[PDB]
Ligand binder design. Structure first.
Ligand SMILES: [Co+2]
Ligand SMILES: [Co+2]
Ligand SMILES: [Co+2]
Ligand SMILES: [Co+2]
Ligand SMILES: [Zn+2]
Length: 586
């Protein structure tokens, strides 16, 4: 049921821009989204992402690995947009029960107060926004008008439009903040600025760093997460649990959005009203355009919904972390028996929850590592595994397990999945112990073989390959195939070309210098600061184990690849052209 007093102004402006073709399509497919109308549009998107020809030429054995090549096959055409919508986005999560709602409000109020003890909400500025625009992903949709975000921020007319929308937000109205599905949702840059202005502080001021949030890992980096998992495992308690949620963003409820909004209770002045506009007008009452193929050509559908979360927003990461922290705390409460029924919370139970949060709240937060929808929890004991009523009633249904089957955890932290990795102790030649990340190698190579844009020059393609190679040399040096592949890419691309997207692999610094900085000098879990003097000193995983986040070391095709790698390197060099290359292949 749509509230036209909040969304009608947005819908009418779109309707007036397409009055001739605007119509209600009685054959529309939307079930749990409110459908408003359609108009004729030009099809956007493509049914395949571009392959990185440099990386591909240097990773020939993986041409026949289906896991690798399947990753290249995206579909952003109207046909492709409707599949993902039908499968993932067109669902409904039931409203939580009264007791669940009271648990969430109490916990969320407590959590915001903890996060705000040492932080103060503030407004982010146009200059902050303009500086970040001169970098990358703001996730704006630029359509018929500017050509890029860098061109828009320089134009004075652009900020006049922002001012017009901002003034409307100040009077509690919204007219241009519309989501576009081209599942990832885009907005026009002015709508992104208004959200960044109101909520960017959560990221800019590191509200979910581990120091400030205890559970969060914002800013940590892959080379630190394994150490953080190992520290959590040192706590007394039950097994470590890491349940994935099925389609987290689609399971964010209106109740969740309202609890995330209580961060406005910590705000003042026009900042509070601006953030309240973002929450009520654009998060809890969203208008979405999505393309749909019809026998008569592509149409754009205008649809709306209150409850879900739009992937790619400014506060998406932080608010997902907030709500997951809140959800996992409540599951810890349920396991410890702090309340007994989610149908309603007795006044005695409500005081018990409040006392539990005051007594042990911060300790229980430190038993968790949470990044967006990704969580690891080491609870007090294993009652957690079957404490499922609040989690299911909040809509956070676990993936790949029956609704009421108890969760299975791990007693060995090196088996716990987190941020799509597992983490291992790696013994150096001098006896020091690294905790390194491991991920399936086919997935790593498949992602490096994907070019991010369309119509990229060979130089930008080569610099993206170099960026992957250097990330591999810093994060996955312990995998035989990736160290070799990284060396080949860096030998094939001119040494002075800059890798193209903050992260430590994004310069032309000597990668051994960066390795020493990351893993030794600035590594707080590395007491002996003696640096290593060569790559030969830096070890691999066991040859049995290395093979098995995906390696091919035992294969005939890999042995041939490794032996003739210089031929492929020379081939790439002949295309970039006469240039100055460094040989990294020892
Ligand atoms: Co018209
Ligand atoms: Co990269
Ligand atoms: Co190198
Ligand atoms: Co430490
Ligand atoms: Zn707006």
């Amino acid at each position: 049921i749509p509230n036209l007093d909040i969304i009608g102004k947005r819908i009418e402006k779109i309707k007036q821009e397409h009055e001739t073709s605007w119509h209600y399509d009685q054959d529309h497919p939307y079930k749990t989204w409110a459908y408003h109308g359609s108009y004729e549009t030009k099809q956007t998107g493509s049914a395949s992402s571009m392959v990185n020809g440099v990386v591909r030429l240097l990773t020939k054995p993986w041409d026949v690995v289906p896991m690798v090549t399947q990753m290249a096959m995206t579909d952003t055409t109207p046909f492709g947009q409707q599949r993902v919508f039908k499968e993932k986005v067109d669902t409904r999560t039931q409203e939580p029960k009264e007791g669940t709602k009271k648990l969430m409000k109490i916990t969320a109020e407590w959590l915001w107060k903890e996060l705000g003890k040492k932080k103060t909400p503030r407004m982010c500025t146009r200059e902050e926004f303009t500086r970040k625009v001169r970098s990358n992903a703001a996730l704006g949709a630029i359509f018929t008008k500017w050509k890029s975000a860098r061109e828009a921020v320089e134009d004075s007319r652009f900020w006049e439009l922002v001012d017009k929308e901002r003034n409307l937000h100040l009077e509690g109205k919204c007219e241009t903040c519309v989501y576009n599905m081209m599942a990832i949702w885009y907005m026009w840059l002015g709508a992104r600025f208004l959200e960044f202005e109101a909520l960017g502080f959560l990221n800019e001021d590191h509200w979910f760093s581990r120091e400030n949030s205890l559970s969060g890992v914002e800013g940590e980096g892959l080379h630190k997460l394994g150490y953080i998992l190992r520290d959590v495992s040192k706590k007394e308690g039950g097994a470590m649990y890491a349940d994935d949620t099925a389609g987290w963003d689609t399971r964010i409820t209106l109740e969740d959005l309202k609890n995330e909004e209580m961060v406005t209770n910590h705000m003042e002045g026009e900042h509070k009203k601006l953030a309240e506009a973002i929450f009520k007008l654009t998060y809890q009452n969203k208008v979405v355009r999505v393309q749909r193929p019809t026998p008569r050509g592509t149409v754009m559908d205008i649809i709306s919904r209150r409850d879900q979360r739009g992937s790619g927003q400014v506060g998406t990461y932080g608010l997902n972390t907030f709500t997951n922290m809140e959800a996992q705390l409540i599951r810890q409460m349920e396991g410890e028996g702090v309340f007994k029924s989610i149908q309603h919370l007795t006044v005695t139970e409500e005081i018990a929850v409040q006392n539990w949060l005051a007594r042990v709240g911060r300790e229980r937060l430190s038993r968790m590592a949470i990044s967006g929808d990704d969580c690891v929890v080491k609870p007090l004991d294993d009652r957690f595994a079957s404490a499922l009523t609040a989690l299911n009633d909040m809509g956070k249904v676990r993936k790949d397990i029956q609704q009421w089957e108890p969760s299975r955890g791990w007693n060995d932290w090196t088996q716990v999945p987190f941020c799509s990795h597992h983490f291992h102790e790696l013994i150096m030649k001098d006896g020091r112990v690294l905790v390194v990340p491991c991920r399936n190698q086919d997935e790593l190579i498949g992602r490096a073989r994907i070019s991010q844009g369309a119509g990229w020059s060979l130089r930008e393609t080569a610099c993206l390959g170099k960026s992957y190679a250097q990330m591999w040399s810093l994060m996955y040096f312990h995998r035989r195939d990736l160290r070799l592949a990284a060396n080949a890419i860096c030998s094939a691309v001119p040494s002075h070309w800059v890798p193209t997207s903050k992260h430590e692999w994004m310069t032309t610094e000597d990668m051994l210098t960066v390795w020493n900085r990351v893993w030794i000098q600035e590594n707080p879990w590395m007491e002996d600061k003696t640096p290593v003097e060569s790559w030969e000193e830096i070890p691999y995983l066991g040859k049995r184990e290395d093979q098995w986040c995906g390696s091919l070391i035992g294969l005939t095709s890999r042995a041939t690849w490794a032996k003739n790698i210089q031929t492929a390197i020379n081939q790439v060099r002949s295309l970039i052209g006469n240039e100055e290359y460094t040989d990294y292949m020892p």
